[PDB]
Amino acid sequence: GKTRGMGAGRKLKSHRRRQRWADKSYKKSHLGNEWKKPFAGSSHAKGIVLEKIGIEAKQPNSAIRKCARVQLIKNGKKIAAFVPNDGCLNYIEENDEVLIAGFGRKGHAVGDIPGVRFKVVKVSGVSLLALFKEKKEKPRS
Amino acid sequence: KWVPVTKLGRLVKDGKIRSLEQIYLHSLPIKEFQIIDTLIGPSLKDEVMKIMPVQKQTRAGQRTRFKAFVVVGDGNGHVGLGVKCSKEVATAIRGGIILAKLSVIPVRRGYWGNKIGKPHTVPCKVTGKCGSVTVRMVPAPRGAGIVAARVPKKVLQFAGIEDVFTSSRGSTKTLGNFVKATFDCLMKTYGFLTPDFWKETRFTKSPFQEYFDILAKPAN
Amino acid sequence: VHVSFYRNYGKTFKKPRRPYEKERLDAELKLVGEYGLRCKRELWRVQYALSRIRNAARMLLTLDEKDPRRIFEGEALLRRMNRYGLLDESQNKLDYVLALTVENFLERRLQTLVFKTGMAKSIHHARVLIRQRHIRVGRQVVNVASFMVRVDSQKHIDFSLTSPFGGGRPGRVKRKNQKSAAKK
Amino acid sequence: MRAKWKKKRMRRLKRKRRKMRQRSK
Amino acid sequence: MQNDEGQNMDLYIPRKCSATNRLITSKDHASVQLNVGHLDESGVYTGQFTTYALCGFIRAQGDADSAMDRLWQKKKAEVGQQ
RNA sequence: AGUCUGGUAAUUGGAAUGAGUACAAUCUAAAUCCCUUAACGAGGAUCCAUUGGAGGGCAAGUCUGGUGCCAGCAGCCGCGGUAAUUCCAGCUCCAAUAGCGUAAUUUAAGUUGUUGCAGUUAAAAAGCUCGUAGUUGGACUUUGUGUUACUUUGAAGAAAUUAGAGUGCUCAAAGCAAGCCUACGCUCUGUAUACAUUAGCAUGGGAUAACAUUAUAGGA
RNA sequence: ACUCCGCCGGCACCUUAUGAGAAAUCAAAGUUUUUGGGUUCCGGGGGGAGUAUGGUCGCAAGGCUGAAACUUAAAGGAAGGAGCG
Ligand SMILES: [K+]
Ligand SMILES: [K+]
Ligand SMILES: [K+]
Ligand SMILES: [K+]
Ligand SMILES: [Mg+2]
Ligand SMILES: [Mg+2]
Ligand SMILES: [Mg+2]
Ligand SMILES: [Mg+2]
Ligand SMILES: [Mg+2]
Ligand SMILES: [Mg+2]
Ligand SMILES: [Mg+2]
Ligand SMILES: [Mg+2]
Ligand SMILES: [Mg+2]
Ligand SMILES: [Mg+2]
Ligand SMILES: [Mg+2]
Ligand SMILES: [Mg+2]
Ligand SMILES: [Mg+2]
Ligand SMILES: [Mg+2]
C-alpha cells in the first residue's frame, strides 16, 4: 500500500514525479515534441496551396472530401487542410495564401476524413465563411 | 372499490391508523398502495425518471420490454422509488407509480449549524451504494441549495431536502443504480444513532395488538 | 509606466454551467418577465451579488461566536442588509442572511419600487420612465433601473423637477402638437 | 497470430538487423 | 431533533434493539417486538407484560435466543416475577 | 349566459424620450469627449440586432421545396443509396444578445489519488530469499543547565493585488474620497483591520515523538 | 498400536453473511466516502512495442534497462421468492 510515514515526504513526492509520466496528457505537454508539429505550438498558420486534392471518406461513409495540400510559410512543412462547406473548393486556387487552423481535436483526426487534422479558414486574406455567404469576394480578376 | 386483504389495510380503511409514522414505528410491511393514498395521498407527487427498454434474445427476434423508473414524494420527508418492467410503456408507468408508493420511507432532516427554522439538510454524513455507484451526502448550510446531478436532485427535492452537498463515484450513467443509491442513503438517515437518540426506548403496543378485537371480527 | 494601469476592474456575473437545462430556463424567464429585466445577464449579476453576501456569512458562521472578527464583520454585514431593506430588525442574526433569495434583491430595485409605489402602471412602464429621466431619488435624478434603493431613501422617490410629470414643461411631442394647433 | 509465434517472428527479425547492422559496423 | 425553541422536528423516534441498542428502521421486517406476560401469586396472567424489541441483525445472527434469555433473567428479578 | 381581468394586430390615437444635430456655457496648458442646456430630432418609431443552432448528448420542426452514399453535414454517436426531423434552401422555432462563433491551459479528474485511486480474473505483485541506505518500530518513570521536533503567544515584517471597515462617483466596475452647517468656518474629518507557506528571532506548555546518555559512576 | 478430551503449529476442505465485490467469487479478496497499523514493488484506453536507439551482462542464444513518430473509438472484465441488473 501507500507509504504513510511522517518522514516519508521525499518518497511520496518522487514517486508521483515518476508516475505522472504514465499519464498521456501530462507526457504530451512536457515531452517537448509539440514544437516539432507543423504548427510548432501555434494556433493558426499561413501557407501556400500546392494542389487541390480529394480524399476518400472513411467507412461506412462514402464521399470525396475536398482538401488542399498546403506548405507552411514559416517552416516549409506540407499538410493536408480540409476545405469545409459546399463548393468552397472553387474559391481556392493553387499557389494561393491560405490561413490554416486546427480541426478541433488538438492534432487528432476528425470525422470520417482519414489523416486530416487541419482546415482552411481564409483564402487570399478573406474568410471562407464570407465567400460562402457572398459577403465578400476574393481580391482578383 | 378497495377491499383490503391485509390487517393494515383494514385498520387504515377503518381509520384506526391515521399516520405513516405509526406504521414506520413498528417496521410493518405495506403491501397495498391504497394505504399510502389514504394517509399522504393528496400531498404526494409522482414523476417518471426514465423509460429504459430492455431486450431478450429469442429465436424469432428480440423481445423488447420497457422499464420505468418512478419517484414519488410529498416534499416533506417522505419519498418513494419504484421500478417496473412491462410490455407497454403506459402499463410500466402505472405499475411503477404503485411500486413507488409501496416503498415510501421517512427521511430524517437536520440542521447544518444553528437550529433556526425548519430542518433543511441531512442530519449527518450518509452514503448509499448500489452496484458500483456510491452517492455521498454532506450537510450543507442554508441557501447552498442541492449541489447534485439531475437524478439525485429530483429525489432530494421530493424528499424535502433544501440544501446538501453531494459527491458520486462509479458509473452514474447507470440511472437505475444512481437513483437507487440516492434512495439508499436517504433511508439511512434514520439508522445512524446520534446522541439525541440515546434516550431509552418507551415501547407502545403495535396496531395489531391494540386493535385485536377489530381485527378478530371478520369484515363483511 | 501608465498610472491608468493601476485602476481596478472586475466581473459582475457568471454564466450557468449547464446552458440548456429546461427547469432553469423556465425559472429564469419567470423572474425576467416578472421584473421586466433586459436579459439573463441582469438576473445573473444579482445571483452573483447574492452569492458573495451568502459566502461572507458562511465564513463568519464557521468561526466562534466570541471571535472578534465574527462580531465586527457580522454586525457590519447585518447593518448593510438592514440599510437596503433586505433584512428586518427582528432578523439580526447571520443565519437569516443565508435565507436571502434573488427576489429580495430584485424587490429593492428602483424599477420595482417605482412600479409598486404606484408611480408606474406596469413593471415595464417603470423601466422606460427611469431611463427617460423622469424619476429622482431625493434631489438626484436617477436613470439606472438597477439602482438599489435604501430604506432611508424609499420615501423620497418622486418625479424629477425637470420632467413633464414633476412640474416641468411638457415634452417636445406635446409642444409641437400645441404649436401645430396654434398655426391652425 | 499466436503470441508465442509472434514473439518468434520478432526475434528472427532482430537477428537480421543485428547482422544487417554489424555488416557495416 | 429539537429546534432552538424546543419543538420536536422528527417524524418519529425509532425503537432501539433491546440487546444491541441499534435503531430499528421502517423496512427492517426481520425485527420483532415481543411481550412476556406477568403472573400473580397463583400464576395467572394479570394483563401486564414486558416488551422486548429485536433488530433483524441480531435475529439473523442467531443470537436472539440467548439475548432474550439474558434480558429476561434480569428483568424478572426486578419486577418480582419468578 | 354574465361581466371583471389578462394576451395578440405594418389597426387607430394622442404622450414620453435619447441616438443624432446644434446657440451656448462648461471642460482643457490649448483643444476634444463627458456632464448641463435654446432650437431641431420617431410609426413599418427603414432610428430595420446580431451570432450560432432546431436527431441525441442539448433548449428548439416527425413543416415545405431541392439533392439521391452525390454534394455535403457531423467535436462524439451518426445523417445522406428517390417519401432526408441531420445536407442545400424557404418558413417557423430555440439559446445568448451588443454581442456571438471557430482554432494553450484550469475545471470536470477519486482518469496522478497527501486529503483520495488501482494491481485474483478488466492495465498492474519482482521466480525466490538475503541485504545497506531509506522509511517504520511494544510496554514502563508524579498521580491523587543533554540536544530537538511539536504547540501557544508575541515581535518583525513593502506597497499594489486578495479579504475587509467607512463613504449614494446618479447606479455600477471604480475611486479615496467626503460630511456638516452657511462662517471668512467646522468635524484633532477619513484614508480602519485581517491574512501573509517555509526558514530565522523571542516567551509559555511538556502530552506525543526523535536523538544522546546509564554499573570498575571521572556520580550527587 | 488403537479409543476419548484438549492445547500450540501446518497443508487444506465444508456451511454460512452480520461483511466485501462489476460480478464470478472470497472466512479473506472482510474490518474502506463512517476513507489513515508499518513497508517494498508496480498500473493509468487500445495499438505501434518489449519494437528502435544508447547502456550493461552473456561464448552465443539472448537477458536486464527501454522510447518516439504515427495510428485508433473502442479493446477488455463478469454475468410472491431470487438477483445491483
Ligand atoms: K500525489
Ligand atoms: K475526500
Ligand atoms: K489443527
Ligand atoms: K413473476
Ligand atoms: Mg494496510
Ligand atoms: Mg434546416
Ligand atoms: Mg430537446
Ligand atoms: Mg424534403
Ligand atoms: Mg445536430
Ligand atoms: Mg487518463
Ligand atoms: Mg482507475
Ligand atoms: Mg487476459
Ligand atoms: Mg491482467
Ligand atoms: Mg513506543
Ligand atoms: Mg464458502
Ligand atoms: Mg483509502
Ligand atoms: Mg496504455
Ligand atoms: Mg417479481
Tab-separated table of N, CA and C in Angstrom, chain C residues 30-87:
chain	number	residue	atom	x	y	z
C	30	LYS	N	-39.217	33.440	-15.831
C	30	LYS	CA	-40.305	33.935	-14.997
C	30	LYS	C	-39.868	35.155	-14.195
C	31	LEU	N	-38.644	35.135	-13.664
C	31	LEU	CA	-38.124	36.303	-12.960
C	31	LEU	C	-37.838	37.447	-13.924
C	32	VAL	N	-37.340	37.134	-15.120
C	32	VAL	CA	-37.042	38.179	-16.093
C	32	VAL	C	-38.314	38.911	-16.500
C	33	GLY	N	-39.387	38.169	-16.779
C	33	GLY	CA	-40.627	38.802	-17.190
C	33	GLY	C	-41.392	39.429	-16.047
C	34	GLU	N	-41.269	38.871	-14.844
C	34	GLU	CA	-41.943	39.450	-13.687
C	34	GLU	C	-41.379	40.822	-13.346
C	35	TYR	N	-40.056	40.974	-13.408
C	35	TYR	CA	-39.388	42.207	-13.020
C	35	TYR	C	-38.922	43.030	-14.214
C	36	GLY	N	-39.343	42.677	-15.424
C	36	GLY	CA	-39.029	43.487	-16.592
C	36	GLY	C	-37.549	43.666	-16.848
C	37	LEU	N	-36.768	42.597	-16.717
C	37	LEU	CA	-35.333	42.675	-16.934
C	37	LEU	C	-35.010	42.675	-18.427
C	38	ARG	N	-33.814	43.172	-18.752
C	38	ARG	CA	-33.398	43.286	-20.146
C	38	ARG	C	-32.965	41.942	-20.725
C	39	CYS	N	-32.294	41.117	-19.933
C	39	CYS	CA	-31.777	39.837	-20.408
C	39	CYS	C	-31.353	39.024	-19.193
C	40	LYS	N	-30.844	37.819	-19.453
C	40	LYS	CA	-30.418	36.944	-18.370
C	40	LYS	C	-29.218	37.499	-17.618
C	41	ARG	N	-28.458	38.407	-18.233
C	41	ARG	CA	-27.296	38.979	-17.562
C	41	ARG	C	-27.705	39.757	-16.316
C	42	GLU	N	-28.801	40.514	-16.396
C	42	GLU	CA	-29.248	41.281	-15.240
C	42	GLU	C	-29.631	40.373	-14.081
C	43	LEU	N	-30.218	39.215	-14.372
C	43	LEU	CA	-30.530	38.256	-13.322
C	43	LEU	C	-29.286	37.546	-12.812
C	44	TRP	N	-28.289	37.341	-13.675
C	44	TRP	CA	-27.099	36.605	-13.265
C	44	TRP	C	-26.204	37.431	-12.350
C	45	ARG	N	-26.172	38.753	-12.524
C	45	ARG	CA	-25.361	39.578	-11.636
C	45	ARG	C	-25.991	39.708	-10.256
C	46	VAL	N	-27.322	39.713	-10.174
C	46	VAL	CA	-27.976	39.689	-8.870
C	46	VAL	C	-27.663	38.386	-8.148
C	47	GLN	N	-27.713	37.261	-8.865
C	47	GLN	CA	-27.299	35.996	-8.273
C	47	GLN	C	-25.833	36.030	-7.874
C	48	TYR	N	-24.993	36.676	-8.681
C	48	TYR	CA	-23.585	36.808	-8.334
C	48	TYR	C	-23.412	37.628	-7.061
C	49	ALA	N	-24.131	38.748	-6.956
C	49	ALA	CA	-24.056	39.566	-5.751
C	49	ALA	C	-24.570	38.806	-4.534
C	50	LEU	N	-25.683	38.085	-4.687
C	50	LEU	CA	-26.229	37.319	-3.572
C	50	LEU	C	-25.248	36.254	-3.104
C	51	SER	N	-24.584	35.580	-4.042
C	51	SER	CA	-23.619	34.553	-3.667
C	51	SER	C	-22.491	35.140	-2.829
C	52	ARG	N	-22.038	36.346	-3.173
C	52	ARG	CA	-20.981	36.990	-2.400
C	52	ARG	C	-21.427	37.259	-0.968
C	53	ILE	N	-22.655	37.746	-0.790
C	53	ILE	CA	-23.157	38.034	0.550
C	53	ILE	C	-23.292	36.749	1.361
C	54	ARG	N	-23.861	35.703	0.757
C	54	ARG	CA	-24.026	34.443	1.475
C	54	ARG	C	-22.681	33.824	1.824
C	55	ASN	N	-21.710	33.911	0.913
C	55	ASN	CA	-20.397	33.340	1.189
C	55	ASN	C	-19.748	34.019	2.387
C	56	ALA	N	-19.869	35.344	2.478
C	56	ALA	CA	-19.308	36.058	3.620
C	56	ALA	C	-19.948	35.595	4.921
C	57	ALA	N	-21.271	35.426	4.926
C	57	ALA	CA	-21.957	34.983	6.133
C	57	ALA	C	-21.509	33.588	6.550
C	58	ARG	N	-21.345	32.676	5.591
C	58	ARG	CA	-20.969	31.309	5.938
C	58	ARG	C	-19.606	31.269	6.617
C	59	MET	N	-18.647	32.052	6.119
C	59	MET	CA	-17.332	32.086	6.748
C	59	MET	C	-17.430	32.581	8.185
C	60	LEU	N	-18.222	33.630	8.418
C	60	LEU	CA	-18.387	34.144	9.772
C	60	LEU	C	-19.060	33.119	10.677
C	61	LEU	N	-20.104	32.453	10.182
C	61	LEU	CA	-20.814	31.473	10.995
C	61	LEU	C	-19.938	30.286	11.368
C	62	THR	N	-18.886	30.013	10.598
C	62	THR	CA	-17.998	28.901	10.909
C	62	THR	C	-17.030	29.227	12.037
C	63	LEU	N	-16.850	30.503	12.358
C	63	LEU	CA	-15.984	30.920	13.448
C	63	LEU	C	-16.734	30.871	14.775
C	64	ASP	N	-15.970	30.914	15.864
C	64	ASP	CA	-16.572	31.002	17.185
C	64	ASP	C	-17.340	32.310	17.319
C	65	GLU	N	-18.486	32.251	17.998
C	65	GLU	CA	-19.310	33.442	18.154
C	65	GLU	C	-18.649	34.502	19.025
C	66	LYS	N	-17.594	34.151	19.758
C	66	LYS	CA	-16.816	35.112	20.529
C	66	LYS	C	-15.616	35.649	19.760
C	67	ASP	N	-15.387	35.177	18.542
C	67	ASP	CA	-14.259	35.655	17.758
C	67	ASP	C	-14.461	37.134	17.427
C	68	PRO	N	-13.487	38.005	17.713
C	68	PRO	CA	-13.701	39.437	17.432
C	68	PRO	C	-14.034	39.725	15.980
C	69	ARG	N	-13.415	39.007	15.041
C	69	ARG	CA	-13.715	39.226	13.630
C	69	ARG	C	-15.144	38.810	13.307
C	70	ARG	N	-15.623	37.735	13.935
C	70	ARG	CA	-17.014	37.330	13.769
C	70	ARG	C	-17.962	38.423	14.241
C	71	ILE	N	-17.655	39.046	15.379
C	71	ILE	CA	-18.532	40.068	15.938
C	71	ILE	C	-18.510	41.330	15.086
C	72	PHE	N	-17.321	41.777	14.677
C	72	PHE	CA	-17.218	43.065	13.999
C	72	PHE	C	-17.810	43.005	12.596
C	73	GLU	N	-17.347	42.063	11.772
C	73	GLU	CA	-17.827	41.999	10.395
C	73	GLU	C	-19.255	41.475	10.321
C	74	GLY	N	-19.661	40.643	11.281
C	74	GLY	CA	-21.042	40.192	11.311
C	74	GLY	C	-22.017	41.333	11.515
C	75	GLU	N	-21.692	42.249	12.430
C	75	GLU	CA	-22.539	43.417	12.639
C	75	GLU	C	-22.570	44.306	11.403
C	76	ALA	N	-21.423	44.476	10.742
C	76	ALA	CA	-21.379	45.304	9.541
C	76	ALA	C	-22.232	44.707	8.429
C	77	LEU	N	-22.182	43.383	8.264
C	77	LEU	CA	-22.986	42.737	7.232
C	77	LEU	C	-24.475	42.887	7.522
C	78	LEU	N	-24.878	42.665	8.774
C	78	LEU	CA	-26.281	42.847	9.138
C	78	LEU	C	-26.710	44.294	8.953
C	79	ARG	N	-25.861	45.238	9.360
C	79	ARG	CA	-26.181	46.648	9.174
C	79	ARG	C	-26.349	46.987	7.699
C	80	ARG	N	-25.550	46.369	6.828
C	80	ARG	CA	-25.663	46.639	5.399
C	80	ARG	C	-26.970	46.093	4.835
C	81	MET	N	-27.377	44.898	5.269
C	81	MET	CA	-28.632	44.329	4.791
C	81	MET	C	-29.833	45.133	5.271
C	82	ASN	N	-29.787	45.645	6.503
C	82	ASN	CA	-30.900	46.438	7.015
C	82	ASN	C	-31.044	47.751	6.256
C	83	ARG	N	-29.925	48.381	5.894
C	83	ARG	CA	-29.981	49.686	5.251
C	83	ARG	C	-30.590	49.637	3.856
C	84	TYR	N	-30.672	48.461	3.238
C	84	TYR	CA	-31.268	48.320	1.917
C	84	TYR	C	-32.630	47.644	1.945
C	85	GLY	N	-33.131	47.276	3.121
C	85	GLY	CA	-34.449	46.684	3.219
C	85	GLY	C	-34.503	45.202	2.938
C	86	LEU	N	-33.368	44.509	2.993
C	86	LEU	CA	-33.344	43.070	2.765
C	86	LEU	C	-33.731	42.298	4.021
C	87	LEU	N	-33.189	42.689	5.168
C	87	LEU	CA	-33.495	42.065	6.444
C	87	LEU	C	-34.320	43.009	7.308
